[PDB]
Design a protein around this ligand. Structure first.
Ligand SMILES: Cn1nc(C(F)(F)F)c(-c2ccccc2)c1N
Length: 123
């Protein structure tokens, strides 16, 4: 149907928006601390602590599969990346602090993303 092609155009343009957002976000992690899943080989008890791991590459595969229906779903995964990091690592540590910084940097990128989504009307 033509309505379905309409729906796909919107979802596609949401995806095109989220790609940009994600590309900006990973630029804010030049250490690439958050680029791949935390390694269970290197952190064997990680899953005893973190029930829902997330990382940028896992977000990008969902993105390109157009599995983000809206900006909220995308944000929730971003929050997992940040929050998981802040649970496992203590406040005085360089990991905890990177997540704080990425959360703050990221909040600006996401602030305008929420406005474009609303303005261009994609949900
Ligand atoms: C975002 N994040 N968080 C963690 C940690 F929670 F496991 F410390 C790690 C990690 C720490 C040591 C080895 C491998 C990965 C990363 N990359």
């Amino acid at each position: 149907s033509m309505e379905q092609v309409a729906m796909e155009l919107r979802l596609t343009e949401l995806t095109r928006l989220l790609r940009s957002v994600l590309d900006q976000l990973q630029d804010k992690d030049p250490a690439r601390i958050f680029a791949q899943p935390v390694s269970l080989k290197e952190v064997p008890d990680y899953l005893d602590h973190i029930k829902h791991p997330m990382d940028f590459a896992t977000m990008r595969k969902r993105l390109e599969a157009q599995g983000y229906k809206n900006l909220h779903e995308f944000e929730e995964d971003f929050d997992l990346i940040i929050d998981n990091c802040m649970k496992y690592n203590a406040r005085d540590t360089v990991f905890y602090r990177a997540a704080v910084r990425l959360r703050d940097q990221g909040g600006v990128v996401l602030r305008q993303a929420r406005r474009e989504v609303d303005s261009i009307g994609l949900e």
